[PDB]
Amino acid sequence: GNRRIRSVGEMAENQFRVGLVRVERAVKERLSLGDLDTLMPQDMINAKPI
């Protein structure tokens, strides 16, 4: 009753989360960086960390 099953879904979701943590830091610095008018939701995010 104290030990818990973490099956395929929960680790995959957690690793997706920690991958998205680097993405949100990157878009933090990029989105806080200015000249934002010509910016589209493609170049802030990067699929390399995910």
Partner: protein
């Protein structure tokens, strides 16, 4: 739960915010048996509308 737990994102200048709408899995580029033959991943591409 992952996208909602991370997004939406203020900028550091409280001027811009990047939020989430929905995701959708793209069609996998090959079949499973083909991905075993070629030696690459049976992977589904992820496309998110932001």
């Amino acid at each position: 739960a992952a996208f909602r737990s991370v997004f939406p994102i203020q900028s550091y200048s409280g001027n811009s915010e990047l939020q989430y709408v929905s995701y959708r899995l793209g069609e996998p580029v090959f079949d499973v048996q083909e991905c075993q033959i070629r030696g690459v991943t049976y992977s589904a591409p992820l496309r998110v509308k932001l």
